Structures are given as structure tokens and as C-alpha cells.
Amino acid sequence: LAEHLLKPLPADKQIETGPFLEAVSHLPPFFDCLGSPVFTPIKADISGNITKIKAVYDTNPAKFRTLQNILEVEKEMYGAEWPKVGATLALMWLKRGLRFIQVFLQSICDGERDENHPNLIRVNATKAYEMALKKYHGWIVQKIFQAALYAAPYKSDFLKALSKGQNVTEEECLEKIRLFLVNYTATIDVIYEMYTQMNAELNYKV
Amino acid sequence: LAEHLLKPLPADKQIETGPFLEAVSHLPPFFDCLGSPVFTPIKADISGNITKIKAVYDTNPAKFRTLQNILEVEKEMYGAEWPKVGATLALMWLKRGLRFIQVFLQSICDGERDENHPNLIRVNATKAYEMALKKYHGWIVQKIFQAALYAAPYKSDFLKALSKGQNVTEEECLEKIRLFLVNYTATIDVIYEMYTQMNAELNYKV
Numbered sequence: 001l002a003e004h005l006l007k008p009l010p011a012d013k014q015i016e017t018g019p020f021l022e023a024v025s026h027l028p029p030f031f032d033c034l035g036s037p038v039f040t041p042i043k044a045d046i047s048g049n050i051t052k053i054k055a056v057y058d059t060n061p062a063k064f065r066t067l068q069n070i071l072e073v074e075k076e077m078y079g080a081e082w083p084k085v086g087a088t089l090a091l092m093w094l095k096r097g098l099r100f101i102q103v104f105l106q107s108i109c110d111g112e113r114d115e116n117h118p119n120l121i122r123v124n125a126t127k128a129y130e131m132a133l134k135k136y137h138g139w140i141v142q143k144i145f146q147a148a149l150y151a152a153p154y155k156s157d158f159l160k161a162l163s164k165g166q167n168v169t170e171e172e173c174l175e176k177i178r179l180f181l182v183n184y185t186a187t188i189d190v191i192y193e194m195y196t197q198m199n200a201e202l203n204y205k206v
Numbered sequence: 207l208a209e210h211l212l213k214p215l216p217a218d219k220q221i222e223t224g225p226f227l228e229a230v231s232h233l234p235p236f237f238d239c240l241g242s243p244v245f246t247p248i249k250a251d252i253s254g255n256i257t258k259i260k261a262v263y264d265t266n267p268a269k270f271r272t273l274q275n276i277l278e279v280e281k282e283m284y285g286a287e288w289p290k291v292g293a294t295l296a297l298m299w300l301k302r303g304l305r306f307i308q309v310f311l312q313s314i315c316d317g318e319r320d321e322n323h324p325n326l327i328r329v330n331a332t333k334a335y336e337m338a339l340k341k342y343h344g345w346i347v348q349k350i351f352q353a354a355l356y357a358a359p360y361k362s363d364f365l366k367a368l369s370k371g372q373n374v375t376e377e378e379c380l381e382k383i384r385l386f387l388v389n390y391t392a393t394i395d396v397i398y399e400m401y402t403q404m405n406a407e408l409n410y411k412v
């Protein structure tokens with residue numbers, strides 16, 4: 001993770017679209033390292049959001065220099081269907097997946113665990129799901145999450161996979177995750193705040 | 207469905223690849239008519255198989271004239287990883303989805319129902335799942351099927367969707383499904399038999 005840190009936030013809290021998309025594009029490949037086909041459709045959905053945002057950006061990178069520019073330009077371009085359109089909608093969902101990853105990783109780094117099963121990551125994933133995604137899912141998708149949770153790797157195995165080849169301890173691995181989390185968390189928080197400020201957030205369930 | 211009937215089988219039971227792929231390519235769009243996002247990853251998997259087979263075919267349509275040609279050419283081309291490779295693997299999975307659809311539709315047409323809930327299609331889908339797919343799924347994916355089953359439409363709604371614009375009765379709709387099922391079922395049966403004859407069938411679970 002720490003090979004692709006996000007940029008620090010500038011004083012004006014603007015997030016450059018190009019570097020943001022470049023950074024977060026390194027996250028979906030991690031889903032191929034979790035040891036299950038159950039992660040295939042997940043990877044697909046997150047990558048699909050990234051692809052959509054990049055496709056809008058590519059139409060005019062200067063116009064879409066920042067994530068704020070995307071929202072404001074699309075609000076002007078689309079009128080009534082906005083924010084349920086375009087890159088605004090894609091980023092609305094992407095931020096939820098990014099927040100899931102943030103909460104999950106932070107929970108692991110913070111030593112949160114089921115003391116009865118300290119080498120599982122279920123409690124960490126459940127917390128992340130509850131905080132990031134659950135209320136945007138109808139009861140059927142929530143039931144699917146609960147089933148998919150059983151496909152999660154052991155903690156020790158997950159941390160091994162995050163540091164393969166590097167010959168580092170788990171303690172060192174977790175320090176590098178904490179480093180990644182600094183600008184990552186700050187960036188996601190700014191994106192959420194922007195959605196509030198722009199009245200671009202929707203609450204529909206799938 | 208009856209606007210894209212499969213070809214009848216010739217005496218030699220060979221199935222031409224091009225027309226087969228053209229016909230079955232009309233089936234994944236039906237998943238957008240079931241009223242739920244839960245069908246998105248399903249459509250993606252079936253379409254992915256079709257795309258893979260078409261990509262192999264397109265490298266040399268004469269060499270890959272029939273489905274039998276695909277298996278025999280790939281067996282020669284690949285040696286030891288076969289049949290877990292290429293279009294052979296894609297068709298191995300595609301036939302299972304096609305068989306699911308066949309069993310499901312046939313069950314509906316045959317009047318099979320839960321007499322306590324005659325306007326659901328759960329019993330029909332469960333039968334199809336059991337016959338076509340279940341034993342290739344580990345327990346986690348099976349649990350996901352059980353959840354996804356609740357996203358199925360009402361029977362009357364499903365049959366309406368299959369005949370939209372046509373101004374036909376449900377009886378007429380079902381007669382047209384029965385017509386589609388004739389060459390469809392025969393074709394799928396031949397494909398299954400070919401996999402047996404070629405020793406191309408695998409039994410691994412996902």
C-alpha cells in the first residue's frame with residue numbers, strides 16, 4: 001500500500017483528479033490477493049467507478065482538474081438528474097468503497113479484534129461495512145455481505161499478502177499501513193465533506 | 207426469446223460456433239429485465255464466457271467452425287492445463303448457465319409451482335440451480351444464491367417482461383417459450399455430451 005501514497009492535501013483542500021485516480025487505481029488489485037472468487041464483483045464495481053470518473057476527466061482534464069470541478073461542472077452540465085449521473089454518481093459510490101477500506105485498515109491497525117478469534121478479520125470488516133456501506137444496501141445485499149464475510153482470509157495471512165517479497169515483520173507492515181492511512185483518510189474525509197457542501201450526496205438503497 | 211431461436215441440430219450433431227454465439231448473446235440482456243441489481247454480476251459472468259469463446263473463434267473462424275472443433279483444437283494447442291483453459295473452460299461454465307436457464311424456463315412452462323405461493327418463481331429457480339450449478343459452488347456461494355433468490359420477480363411480472371409490447375396472453379407467451387426450448391434444450395444436451403465424450407468436464411467448486 002505504501003508504494004502508492006496519496007498526495008498530501010493543499011491548504012485549499014482541493015484534490016487533483018488525475019493524481020487521485022492514479023493512486024486509487026492501485027487498490028482494486030488487492031482484491032485478487034484475498035484468496036476468493038467472491039471478491040471478483042467487488043473489484044469490478046470499484047474499478048467501474050474509477051473508469052467512469054477517468055472517462056469524464058479525459059474529455060477535458062483542465063476543466064476537470066479537481067474533484068470539486070467535476071461536481072460543479074456536472075451540476076451545470078446536467079441540471080435535474082444530477083447528482084445521480086456521471087462521474088458525480090461514480091465518485092459517490094467510490095468514496096463509500098474507499099471509506100470501507102479506510103475503516104477496515106484502521107481497525108486492523110488499531111488492534112481491534114474478537115478476543116475469542118484474534119486471527120480473523122470479521123469484526124474489522126463488519127465495522128467497516130456498517131460505517132461505509134450498509135445503509136445503502138437493501139436487506140438482500142446485506143444478507144449477501146454476511147455470507148461473503150466467511151470468505152475473508154485470516155489476519156496473519158492477509159498481512160503476509162500485503163507485504164509479499166518485502167521480508168518485513170507484521171509490525172513493520174502495520175506501520176506502513178498506518179503511513180498510507182494518513183493522507184488516504186484525510187482525502188476521503190474531504191471528499192465526503194464536499195458531497196455535503198455541494199448537496200451531491202444521495203441516500204437511496206440498492 | 208422466440209425472436210432468436212437456436213438452429214436445429216444437423217444429423218452429425220455438430221454445432222456451428224458463430225451462429226451459436228450469436229443466438230446465446232441474446233440471453234444476457236434478459237437479466238436487466240428482472241428488476242434487481244443483484245443480477246448484474248450474473249450477466250457479467252455469462253457474457254464474459256461468450257466474449258472469451260468469441261475471441262478464440264475470431265482468431266480463425268474456419269479452424270473453430272464448430273464447438274467440437276474448439277475443444278479438439280484447444281486440446282492439441284494446450285496440452286496439460288486443458289481443459290481448464292481457453293474457450294473450453296469458458297464453454298464449460300457457459301453451458302451450466304445455459305442449462306440453468308433451460309431448466310428454469312422448462313419448469314415454469316411445465317406448471318411447476320409452490321401451490322402455497324403460485325405467483326413466485328422460487329421453486330423453479332431452486333430446481334434449476336440444483337440441476338445446473340449447485341455442486342460447482344462451495345458453501346459460501348450457495349448461501350449467496352439463497353439470498354439472491356429473494357430478488358426474483360413474481361411469475362406474472364416475469365412473463366409480462368418476456369412479452370412487453372407484443373400484446374399476447376400469458377398462454378401465448380408460454381407457448382413461445384416452449385418453442386424456444388426445443389432447439390435450445392437439444393443443443394445444450396449435445397454440448398454436455400460432447401464434454402463427456404472429450405473428457406473436457408471438470409468438477410471443481412468455486
Ligand SMILES: CCCCCCCC/C=C\CCCCCCCCCCCCCC(=O)N[C@@H](CO[C@@H]1O[C@H](CO)[C@H](O)[C@H](OS(=O)(=O)O)[C@H]1O)[C@H](O)/C=C/CCCCCCCCCCCCC
Pocket residue numbers: 027030031034041042045046048049050052086089090091093094096097100101104121125133141144145148149151152153206243244245247248339347350351354
Ligand atoms: C487495501 C486492501 C483491501 C481491503 C479490503 C479487504 C476486506 C476483506 C475483508 C472482508 C470481506 C468482507 C466482504 C466484502 C465487503 C466489500 C466492501 C468493499 C467495497 C464494495 C464495492 C461495492 C459498492 C456498492 O455497494 N455498489 C453497489 C451500487 O453500485 C453502483 O450503482 C450505481 C447505480 O445505482 C452505479 O451503477 C454505480 O457505478 S457508476 O460508476 O455507474 O456510477 C455503481 O457503483 C453495487 O450494486 C454492489 C456491488 C457488489 C455486488 C453485489 C451483488 C452480488 C449478487 C450475487 C448474486 C449471485 C447469486 C447466484 C449465484 C449463482
Ligand SMILES: CCCCCCCC/C=C\CCCCCCCCCCCCCC(=O)N[C@@H](CO[C@@H]1O[C@H](CO)[C@H](O)[C@H](OS(=O)(=O)O)[C@H]1O)[C@H](O)/C=C/CCCCCCCCCCCCC
Pocket residue numbers: 037038039041042133141144145148233236237240247248251252254255256258292295296297299300302303306307310327331339347350351354355357358359412
Ligand atoms: C431467459 C430469461 C432469464 C432466465 C433466468 C432468470 C432466473 C431468475 C430467477 C431467480 C433468481 C435466482 C438467483 C440467480 C441464479 C443465477 C443463475 C444464472 C447463471 C449463473 C452465472 C454464473 C456461473 C458461475 O457459477 N460462475 C462462477 C465461476 O466462474 C467461472 O470461473 C472460471 C475460473 O474458475 C472462469 O473465470 C470462467 O470464465 S472464463 O470465461 O474465463 O472461462 C468463469 O465463468 C462465478 O464465480 C460466479 C459468478 C456469480 C457471482 C457470485 C459472487 C458474488 C459475491 C458478492 C459478494 C458481495 C459482498 C459484499 C457486498 C458489498
